[PDB]
Every structure is written in structure tokens, then in C-alpha cells.
Amino acid sequence: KAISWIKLQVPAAQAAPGAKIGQALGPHGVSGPQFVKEFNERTAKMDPGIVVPVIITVYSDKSFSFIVKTPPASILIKKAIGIESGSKKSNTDKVGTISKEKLMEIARIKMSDLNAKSESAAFKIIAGSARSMGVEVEK
Amino acid sequence: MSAKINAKKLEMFDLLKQFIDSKQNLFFLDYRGLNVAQLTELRNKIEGEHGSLKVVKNNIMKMVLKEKNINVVDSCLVGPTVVVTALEEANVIAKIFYDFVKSSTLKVKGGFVLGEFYDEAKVQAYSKLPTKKESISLFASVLKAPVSKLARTLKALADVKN
Amino acid sequence: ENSRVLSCQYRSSFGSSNARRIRAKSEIPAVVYGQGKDVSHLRIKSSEFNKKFAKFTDNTVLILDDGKLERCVFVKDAAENIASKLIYHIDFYEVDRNVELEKYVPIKLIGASIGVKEGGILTVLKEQVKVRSLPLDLPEFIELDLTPVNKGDSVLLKDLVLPSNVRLAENDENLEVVIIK
Amino acid sequence: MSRIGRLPIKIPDAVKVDVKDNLVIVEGIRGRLVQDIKDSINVKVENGSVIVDRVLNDKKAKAYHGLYRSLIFNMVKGVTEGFSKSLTINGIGYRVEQQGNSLFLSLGYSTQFEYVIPDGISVKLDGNTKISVEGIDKFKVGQVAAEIRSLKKPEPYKGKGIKYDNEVIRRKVGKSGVKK
RNA sequence: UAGAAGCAGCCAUACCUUUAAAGAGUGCGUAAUAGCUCACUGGUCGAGUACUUAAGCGCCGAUAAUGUAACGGGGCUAAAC
């Protein structure tokens, strides 16, 4: 069993054992530098600077298993459509358009962390996230 | 204020009846304390195994089974019980249930395979039992065992004249 | 079909004091006129009227049975005291049960429209539509769902899905009932 | 009325119950308890069980239904299993000790409190900061535990005082919680 | 915004999925989470319950200075309506 469960967001290609990583790793007796090295090794194949979510389970035997899932969907959509800062009035002030093909590709890519059984359902989850961020749905 | 409840209950009964008529084999599991993640993983495993597991109202399920000629002990419906219909791999479903019972507190309260009300012991035996392909492989191995023994004995006897 | 039937019996009191006594006995004085007949003075059970026609409009039509005859009547008027929720007179306009007739009927808007969702402007050009039917089949109100109506879309009168024996009567069939710009 | 008033009363084998002339006697392994029952309610012992009903349907009788059902139930559970309510003494220098049929409490006051224990009730210690009152009557047990708690009611700044074990004390802050 | 991880604050929550059922979260409380709870739904139990409307009597609101002192008194659960 895992003694501690930690959920964090990390900068892909920039995983270092600074204050944040040390605070995350020290509470559960987990090697913060080892976790940072594993995160860098995993996120080398990820976009540099991308905030990849990380779920870490630290057992009683001091071992920690840390998995970096698909990065934030809001971050991925903002990168795709050139969105850096989320539009405040996401209901009216559209920040951009989320293309149908781009949404389908993003949903297929992030289907690992999405619990849907249909590609249409995954694309709908992506589109709902885009609407919540304020991105106008692509027709 | 009661027609709407009647309509919702009728729709639930119809969906449950469709599942019960589509499922060749059925089982009921008491999953009290089975966490959200554990339930999601168990449902994913059942879906991969082709079974459909879902929570069904005890009274509605009992009425539907009484209509459909399912004469099981009501103790199976006693307790929050997810009904899982498996039509192809009953051994696989039982093995998955046993694995969940090992890795969590879920219990296989009742079972119904070929209209046979399987109690705790019968359900455990069925779950430990393997599938049809594995059974064929085991029967083939058992049948070939005498042939392999005879061939080995003949080889040893022939060598013993060296 | 019962829920459109109403039991009455004749009254011969005809006074303010008499009407007050009737309403104390928990009934409603009422009169029926139309079709050139002599006016019929009758009384109605208040509990029955409340139970059945708690939502009556100008276009509601119903059946009066005095045990010996049937009448098809509109609720032409109803004198209501708002403070005490008290009906204290009913006017029933009779019509012929088999004569086609016209009547403006209001619309009821349902659903959330995609256009208004995305920045459309509701403009309810028409609050009612002239329809045509026999009295017993007149629609109380005609429904309209806006959900598929996207931006820059107007609603044609033919687009209104209508009850079975109800038919449009507008001279301008192509006028728009509600627009979303 | 409501289902507690009509819910039947099971009788343990070791426990005997008897009803007569507006009185009930319940004799068990650990003692004997008595109760008055009002005229409007009738109590019956049949088939090793106790049932209660009402001759009338006035609201006094409605309430009495449940009241006497519950009392007789607690009257039977006591004679079989006895009632016990426990307490904890928390705080610097607070102590409790026992001598015979009385308890001595050190609770910060300039006098050491003696406490006569009423008859029919026993007191059990666990070290010098844990108490448990046991007895035949739930009413008496609650009374004693309450009066002991009143000897030094708890406080919210540090949890000091005499608390019911099941109780949860809402807690405030003092100096350093207001830190800016 | 510095934080806002459901709970300073802006916007909707036409955000989807596994859906039994889970709200862009009901409250408590954390700089920020964290943490504890609820709507929500499942099992044990086994009929009325939950919100309102109109009337007949009632409750609190009710509160000055020589002495009970706002039934004439005694008293009255009718000897009240």
C-alpha cells in the first residue's frame, strides 16, 4: 500500500528539486531529486515548460512511484490556439477558436487520463474544457 | 407527484430487464467500502472481460427476477449489491471477483449461472474454475500425459540396453 | 375527457344577498349566453372548478352538463378577488360545437436556443398566432422549442408543430414569430 | 405517532418482565427496576415480548406511547447489560482518586473536592485521568456523569476540564492564532 | 490575485465522462491548498411524510410608580368559547 498520495503539476523539461519539489517529497519521505530526475526523463519527450500533472504514491518502505499524466488540457489548448492568459469572461469574451481536428487530436493524445470509452466523448470533454476556458467551439 | 416516479421506475425496470435478458450469467456483489477508484477499476476490468456491472435497485431487481423466473435467495439483494451480467466468461468474471475480494472488501454475495443459484461456495468454486479454452488445454495435457509417459519409458528402456 | 366536463344545477335566487349565501355554501354563480338562446342561470361547485381549471385562459373551452344537456362554452369571464382567492361569478359564452372558428392563441417558449447561447438577440415579434379548429380541439397554448434555432434565425409560422386538428389561419404565413439576431 | 412507539420489545431469556396495576417490574441478572405507566397506555407481555398501545388517540397518549416504550426498553437493556458512560479529565495538574464510595478531585481550585457516589452506581478508574460510571439505570448514570462534568465544565481554548468521551469540544484560539 | 486547488472576488456550471450518483460543490476551516461534511445515489427498516392555503380557538411580542388591581369578589378546566 501507499502511505502518502501526492498530486502536483510540474514543468516539463524543467524538473528540478527546488523548494516546491522538496516540500512535495519530504513530507512522504520521497527522494525529491530522484523524482525530479524521473520527471525530466519522462518529460524530455514532453513539451518544454508544459505543466504535466504528476501523481505520486509513496509507500511505507520509502519507495515512491510517480507518474506524469497528460498535461493540463487548458494549457494544451492555449498552446494550440496561441492562448497564454485565460480570458476572464469565458462566457462572452472569447479568447480564440478550438478547431475540430485539433480538438480530436488533443483528445486522442490525452485519452490516457480521460476515462471516456468513445472518441466522440473525449472530444466533447475537450470541447467542454475549451468552453470553460472561453475558447469558441470550432464548427 | 407519483406519475413521474412511476415513469422513472418503469424506465429503470425496462433497462434492467434488457440487461437481464441480454446476460446469460449473472451475479450480485456487495461492494460496501469499495472506493470510487476501486469501483472504477473493477468496472473497467469487467468491461474488458465483456461483462456489464451496475447498481440495480433491490426491490426492482427482485420484482423483475420474479417475473423472469429467477428464484434466488433474497439475501443476495440484501446489502448494497451491484448486479454484474457476464454472458461469455463466467470463470473470468468469478476470478475477477476473487481478485477484488483479495485486494478489497468486495464480496460475491450471490450468483446465477445457467439459472443455477450459486451460493458462496459454488460461486467461489466457479470463480476459481478456468475458461473453456483453458479447460481444453488442460484436458489435452491430461490426455497426452499417458502418451508422454509411455514414450519416455520406451526411450529409457531402449537406452538401458546401451 | 372528464377533466373537461363540469356539473351545474339551475338557480333562481337572483340577488346580492342570495349570491352571497350561495358562495357561502361554496358554489359559484354563473350565467351562459350565446347562440341567440335565452340566458341560462346556474351554479357551479367551487372545489370542482378550482381542481380542474386552476389555469384557465381566454382560450380555454369546456363542456357544461346540467344532467340533461351538454353545452360547449368558452370561459368568457370570471370575477376573481385576488386577496381571498375567491371566484364570485362566471360568464360562459356558448359556441356551436361543430362550427369552425378562429382564435388568437398564445405561444409558450421552451428550450435554450443555440443562437442566444452564442450571442443571439431574442425579439418576440408575435406573442400569439391565429389558429382554426372546432371548439373542443382548440389548443390552450402552442409550444415552440428554440434550441435548434441558431444565430440569425427567425421562426416561420409553418414551423410551429401544431396539435392534430388545429390549423394555421394567418393571412401572412411567412411572418416571423420570434427572431434571434 | 411513530414507529418507535410501536416497535416490539424483545425480552432476553435471563430477563423477566411483569406488569400489574399501572406498575412494571423488570428483574434481570444485574438488578431490578420499576416504572409507573399512565392509564392511557397499556403494556402487554406475550410470547416473550413486550408490546405497548393506547386506549385513546389524544396527543398526550401519542407521546406517552413512545415514552414508555423507550423507558421499558432501557429498563430491560439495563437489567441485562447495564449502562455505562465515561469521562476524561484533561488539564495540567488535574487528578482524580477513589477511596471507598467517594472520589477526590483535584481541579485547580484551592480546595480538593470530595464527591460522595450515590448508591446503585459504581465508578471505575483508568489511571488518574479517565472515569467510567456504570450502573443499572441509564437515568442515574447520566445524572452522575453530568454532575461530575458540572464540577468542572470544559473550556474551548485548551480543552481543559472534564469532558464526555463521546463529546466533541469546539475549539477557539487565543494569542497566536490572531497573528498577522 | 501572490495564492483562490469546490468554498477573497469576476464570469457560466449550453463542462464532459465512469455515470448507481457526485453540484465550476452545502457549510465548517486552512495565507494557498490540505482536512472535515452535504446536496447527490445505493442497502436496513417499514406509511404516510415535506412544503403550503383557508377558517375555529390558542402562544410569544405584553411593558411603572400607596396595595393583589386589565373577571366586581370568592372561585371556576367549565362555572370558558
From Swiss-Prot, chain A:
PANTHER family: 60S RIBOSOMAL PROTEIN L12, LARGE RIBOSOMAL SUBUNIT PROTEIN UL11M. This is Large ribosomal subunit protein uL11. Keywords: Methylation, Ribonucleoprotein, Ribosomal protein, RNA-binding, rRNA-binding. NCBIfam families: L11_bact. Belongs to the universal ribosomal protein uL11 family. One of its GO terms (biological process) is translation. GO terms for cellular component: cytosol; cytosolic large ribosomal subunit. It holds the Pfam family Ribosomal_L11. It comes from the Bacteria. One or more lysine residues are methylated. GO terms for molecular function: large ribosomal subunit rRNA binding; structural constituent of ribosome. Forms part of the ribosomal stalk which helps the ribosome interact with GTP-bound translation factors. InterPro entries: Ribosomal_uL11 (IPR000911), Ribosomal_uL11_bac-typ (IPR006519), Ribosomal_uL11_C (IPR020783), Ribosomal_uL11_C_sf (IPR036769), Ribosomal_uL11_CS (IPR020785), Ribosomal_uL11_N (IPR020784), Ribosomal_uL11_N_sf (IPR036796). Part of the ribosomal stalk of the 50S ribosomal subunit. Interacts with L10 and the large rRNA to form the base of the stalk. L10 forms an elongated spine to which L12 dimers bind in a sequential fashion forming a multimeric L10(L12)X complex.
UniProtKB/Swiss-Prot annotation, chain B:
It comes from the Bacteria. The keyword GTP-binding does not apply. One of its GO terms (molecular function) is structural constituent of ribosome. GO terms for cellular component: cytosol; large ribosomal subunit. InterPro entries: Ribosomal_uL10, Ribosomal_uL10-like_sf, Ribosomal_uL10_bac, Ribosomal_uL10_bac_type, Ribosomal_uL10_CS_bac. Keywords: Ribonucleoprotein, Ribosomal protein, RNA-binding, rRNA-binding. One of its GO terms (biological process) is translation. Forms part of the ribosomal stalk, playing a central role in the interaction of the ribosome with GTP-bound translation factors. Part of the ribosomal stalk of the 50S ribosomal subunit. The N-terminus interacts with L11 and the large rRNA to form the base of the stalk. The C-terminus forms an elongated spine to which L12 dimers bind in a sequential fashion forming a multimeric L10(L12)X complex. Belongs to the universal ribosomal protein uL10 family. PANTHER family: 39S RIBOSOMAL PROTEIN L10, MITOCHONDRIAL. HAMAP family: Ribosomal_uL10 (MF_00362). This is Large ribosomal subunit protein uL10. It comes from Borreliella burgdorferi (strain ATCC 35210 / DSM 4680 / CIP 102532 / B31). The lineage of its organism: Bacteria, Pseudomonadati, Spirochaetota, Spirochaetia, Spirochaetales.
UniProtKB/Swiss-Prot annotation, chain C:
Belongs to the bacterial ribosomal protein bL25 family. CTC subfamily. This is Large ribosomal subunit protein bL25. It comes from Borreliella burgdorferi (strain ATCC 35210 / DSM 4680 / CIP 102532 / B31). This is one of the proteins that binds to the 5S RNA in the ribosome where it forms part of the central protuberance. GO terms for cellular component: cytosolic large ribosomal subunit. Part of the 50S ribosomal subunit; part of the 5S rRNA/L5/L18/L25 subcomplex. Contacts the 5S rRNA. Binds to the 5S rRNA independently of L5 and L18. The lineage of its organism: Bacteria, Pseudomonadati, Spirochaetota, Spirochaetia, Spirochaetales. Disulfide bonds: none annotated. Keywords: Ribonucleoprotein, Ribosomal protein, RNA-binding, rRNA-binding. InterPro entries: Rbsml_bL25/Gln-tRNA_synth_N, Ribosomal_bL25/Gln-tRNA_synth, Ribosomal_bL25_b-dom, Ribosomal_bL25_C, Ribosomal_bL25_long, Ribosomal_L25_dom, Ribosomal_uL5_bac-type. Pfam families: Ribosomal_L25p (PF01386), Ribosomal_TL5_C (PF14693). GO terms for molecular function: 5S rRNA binding; structural constituent of ribosome. One of its GO terms (biological process) is translation.
Curated annotation (Swiss-Prot), chain D:
The keyword RNA-binding applies. InterPro entries: Ribosomal_uL6-like, Ribosomal_uL6-like_a/b-dom_sf, Ribosomal_uL6_a/b-dom, Ribosomal_uL6_bac-type, Ribosomal_uL6_CS. The keyword Signal does not apply. One of its GO terms (biological process) is cytoplasmic translation. GO terms for cellular component: cytosolic large ribosomal subunit. Keywords: Ribonucleoprotein, Ribosomal protein, RNA-binding, rRNA-binding. One of its GO terms (molecular function) is structural constituent of ribosome. It holds the Pfam family Ribosomal_L6. Part of the 50S ribosomal subunit. Belongs to the universal ribosomal protein uL6 family. This protein binds to the 23S rRNA, and is important in its secondary structure. It is located near the subunit interface in the base of the L7/L12 stalk, and near the tRNA binding site of the peptidyltransferase center. This is Large ribosomal subunit protein uL6.
